[PDB]
């Protein structure tokens with residue numbers, strides 16, 4: 682199996698690079714992280730910060746989650762992220778993405794003990 686917390690790291694953490702390196706980035710990473718195995722995951726954000734920095738977000742600004750739950754938190758500082766969005770030529774199993782680097786606040790849902798990120802909700 683895989684815990685919620687490990688799945689979050691798998692799907693959203695990329696501390697080895699500080700920015701969306703190339704135009705190839707999303708195509709390479711979505712595949713690599715197994716996010717295009719059952720279908721082409723539509724949108725997925727990678728965070729280029731240390732894991733400790735991202736976990737710290739669970740003690741930052743408490744905001745409502747898009748689903749109405751209240752266990753979402755917004756980072757006080759902007760972070761380096763790469764946004765991956767599915768293109769048109771993208772036809773499963775040949776998923777195609779547009780790589781987009783940006784610096785924004787991230788909003789994650791947290792839970793458990795230790796209280797850690799389990800879902801990426803939004804970037805603002």
Ligand SMILES: Nc1ccn([C@@H]2O[C@H](CO)[C@@H](O)[C@H]2OP(=O)(O)O)c(=O)n1
Pocket residue numbers: 689692724725726727799800801802803804
């Ligand atoms: N800016 C966004 C919005 C959504 N997602 C991911 O796409 C899913 C569908 O919105 C979200 O739940 C989240 O993945 P996950 O919940 O698995 O962290 C993301 O990575 N980045």
